[PDB]
Amino acid sequence: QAIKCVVVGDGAVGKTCLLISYTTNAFPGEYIPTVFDNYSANVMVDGKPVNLGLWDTAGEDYDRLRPLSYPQTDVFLICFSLVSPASFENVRAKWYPEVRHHCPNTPIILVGTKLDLRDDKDTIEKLKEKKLTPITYPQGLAMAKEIGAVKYLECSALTQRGLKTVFDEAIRAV
Amino acid sequence: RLQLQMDNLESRVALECKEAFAELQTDIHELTSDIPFLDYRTYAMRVLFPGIEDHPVLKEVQANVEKSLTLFGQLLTKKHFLLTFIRTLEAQRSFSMRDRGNVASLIMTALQGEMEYATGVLKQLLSDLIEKNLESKNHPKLLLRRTESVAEKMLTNWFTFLLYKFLKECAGEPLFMLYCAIKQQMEKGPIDAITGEARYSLSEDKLIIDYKTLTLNCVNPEHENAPEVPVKGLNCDTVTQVKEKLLDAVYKGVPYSQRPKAGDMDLEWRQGRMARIILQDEDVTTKIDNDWKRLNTLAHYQVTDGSSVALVPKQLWHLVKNIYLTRLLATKGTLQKFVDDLFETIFSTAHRGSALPLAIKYMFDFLDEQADKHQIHDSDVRHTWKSNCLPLRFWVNVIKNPQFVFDIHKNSITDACLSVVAQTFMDSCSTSEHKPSNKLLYAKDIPNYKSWVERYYADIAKMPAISDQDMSAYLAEQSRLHLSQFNSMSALHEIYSYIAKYKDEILVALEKDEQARRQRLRSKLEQVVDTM
């Protein structure tokens, strides 16, 4: 069975590298803002073939065009950088409102990207000084139950640490 | 004062024209060098019956009718029958020009297998029509413009049947070239999909800033897995406008009465790999603040240059919102060439190997006869009889309506430009002088277009006549080639429907004239009616 899914989230949070480091099991390199794309991957979950079709969307110049990806969606994957508290806040204000607007009553699987930036020391250099700290599991898990997200899942598009865990639940929630 | 105020605007836009016209000829040439003429069947129908996409002409089988069908046929061929039949009806105050216009078309749709004959009747109907009007002391110049009687409506048809060949071996080109000069110059800029107004509008009425030029790479629908087809466009065109652009560029060869209509097709922005969305001209994602609908455009959907696109089976205000003459001269100058070409090959006796159609010469010989028959030495008079016959009746008709000749689709703005040319075309035929927007643009061109229409008439007069023998040969040729091109049964049965209405007056006259009585024609008439 086919399961349509959309990946909405702020710019440069790792939505493309998330959908690439999975469909091709390889992580690219340089960043090129996405306008809108579509991937495919057929895997078996708990013994049941699925036609997962990931819908990479943009992230504010493409807001007047983005909504053309929501039609007939069975699951959404709001995204925010684990090292970008700025994006973490836009989860409740920017994305959750918009998502539940066009396709309400559809599951939502919040996701924290760049897990590899958590256990890092170099990133902390540019964080501690900026008086801001990375997003902790609690701060996020609460944000999940708040927005009515079926599950909170954090991974790293680069290291593939629990990356397969995410998409496994997005299908289990449908 | 006004004449010295325009030649200054023409000089500034002069150089712009040379680079504007050039970019069109190179584009239009290749867009047709490496013609969708409506076949005689289609062409002739759209001319004898305005806006009649319906039958019965090309089509029924009736038993007790066919036996009486031959009666009305051989009886209508009788010179006198067809004359008294018309003279009696026209004499009645029952039917208006509207009916006098169909009857003239039905008969031509019946005698097409004997054009050598119907030409004899037409001359006889045009004779009396001239006599009656000069026996009543009507002003000569004001004769064929306009009473639009029965004869005149047959004459309008006479030229339609015969000048087809000429719209092929000659005239066909500069016209389609003129049409494709407009269609391609209006799209050079923005075209309000709601108002019809355009950026480079030729008419100072449908005349509409900042806009960019993008270039997409459509995927030819008719094929697959082969080179793409780029299409130059704007970032302001409606999704519906663009679907027209692509359909014109993708189906360059294929005519229009075959292309998949723009409505039955949906535009899909092809991006990434297998990712494509269906951009509708008006869907859920639409801009607007107050109670009003905003047509979806390119910038609204944010379209990128070089974007890939494909046409797939489908399944308010636009732009403007209410010395501005300098732009008008830009268009008047750019197309200045395309027109002179047509007006030249219209008023041309010998053009590209092809000589003057016999139809014209033979008919212009005729008017000179009737003119010399009444000692009408005034050249102005017979100059205006000719104009009101060919140019201002058959020509002006297909200049304003080029879809009668071609298999094309005249849009909104294009029609507002052919009118301005069609207007100038008339004025150039008129012998009378003149002293707003239209008359001002071509104020310094009307004098010249006139000299052409004079020389054109003079040349036909100098030429050697056509023997009544050669004409009956040429007419018989054009009568056999398109003999059974149309279901004559439908046209002949239609005429019979009228002879029933005023059967009274018809029989009284068919018994009054010693002619129709001597050859006991009234009897053959009574047999035709009862039987049917």
Ligand SMILES: Nc1nc2c(ncn2[C@@H]2O[C@H](COP(=O)(O)OP(=O)(O)NP(=O)(O)O)[C@@H](O)[C@H]2O)c(=O)[nH]1
């Ligand atoms: N180390 C590391 N870098 C990551 C990870 N995810 C994303 N990035 C980095 O984030 C940058 C932007 O990635 P991208 O997926 O394109 O972000 P995006 O969400 O697609 N941006 P947009 O929506 O604007 O296209 C890349 O340069 C990439 O190296 C991750 O898990 N680990």
Ligand SMILES: [Mg+2]
């Ligand atoms: Mg992206």
